[PDB]
């Protein structure tokens, strides 16, 4: 994570290509008088922000002595990108990886993890995500070499974003951020960037996005929602709510609509949470007080992983 000069040097390992991602102004889709900057975490080597979390878990836990290659087994319950990033980096680094998820998950999700050699344990469909969480806990309780990646609570998650994501944004925006907006999954991205910005003296407003259908930060009841990657249904220990100026709820259908408009308007091809974050950014950018101001948000994951999902189902009947 020391600045590594990629367009100009040869990496020794693919994990040196994580982070240091581009930033892009929203153009055609931005009809307001505010500037909207997209931090393109879809451009990480395995196509989402969770590459930063994966690397921070392996790198930091190894350096602390908690992970020992060839011996420690990394376990996590994930039907999304954290599983992918843990399976990718564990393969390279000599760790067995076990990811649990319900048996009703798509072939694409299971297949991507098995390509990197992870053990996928499929738990009964009727038990949902809770059954997969329970299985990962059982494995870690039973086996002294098994450790939970612990994405919603690990101290490594907000830290990596404070050390890398946030300072990158600060350099790219020429030390000028009026608002940082990001959907909260584990909360690492919002927490770590908000810390970095505040230490640099930025008065940026920090805005958390969550699904209208699972408005847990706002004070409402958890529930099922469409916006894959955010809205865990609880407040993760990683998230530092004291840093947040506003929780903005975005409806799953606004996220979906925005994702499809973004591909055609700006050529940005992302998942449901990138459409939620941009829908939120455009809402804030409409506020008259934000004229001539810089709003930065995140495109968390590249769109190709969503072809099989609901997200682009409309394209069929168009």
């Amino acid at each position: 994570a020391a600045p590594f000069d990629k367009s100009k040097n040869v990496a020794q390992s693919i994990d040196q290509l994580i982070g240091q991602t581009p930033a892009l102004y929203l153009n055609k889709l931005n009809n307001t008088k505010a500037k909207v900057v997209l931090k393109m975490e879809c451009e990480n080597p395995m196509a989402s922000v969770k590459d930063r979390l994966g690397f921070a878990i392996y790198d930091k836990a190894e350096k602390e002595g908690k992970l020992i290659p060839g011996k420690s087994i990394v376990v996590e319950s994930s039907s999304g990108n954290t599983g992918v990033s843990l399976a990718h980096l564990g393969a390279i680094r000599g760790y067995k990886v076990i990811i649990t998820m319900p048996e009703s998950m798509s072939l694409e999700r299971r297949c991507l993890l098995r390509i990197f050699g992870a053990e996928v344990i499929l738990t009964p469909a009727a038990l949902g995500m809770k059954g997969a969480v329970a299985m990962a806990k059982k494995i870690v309780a039973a086996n002294p070499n098994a450790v939970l990646a612990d994405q919603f609570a690990t101290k490594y998650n907000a830290l990596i974003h404070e050390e890398t994501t946030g300072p990158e944004i600060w350099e790219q925006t020429n030390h000028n951020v009026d608002c940082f907006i990001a959907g909260v999954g584990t909360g690492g991205t919002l927490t770590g960037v908000a810390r970095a910005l505040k230490k640099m003296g930025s008065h940026a407003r920090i805005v958390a996005v969550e699904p209208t259908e699972s408005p847990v930060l706002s004070g409402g009841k958890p529930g099922p929602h469409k916006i894959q990657g955010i809205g865990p249904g609880f407040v993760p220990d990683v998230l530092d709510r004291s840093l947040i100026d506003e929780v903005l709820c975005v409806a799953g259908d606004d996220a979906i609509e925005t994702a499809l408009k973004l591909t055609r308007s700006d050529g940005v091809f992302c998942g449901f949470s990138g459409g939620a974050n941009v829908y939120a950014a455009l809402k804030i950018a409409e506020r008259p007080e934000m004229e001539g101001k810089t709003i930065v948000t995140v495109i968390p994951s590249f769109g190709e992983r969503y072809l099989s999902t609901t997200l682009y189902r409309s394209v069929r009947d168009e």
Partner: peptide
Amino acid sequence: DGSGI
């Protein structure tokens, strides 16, 4: 969702 994360 799923956990989706």
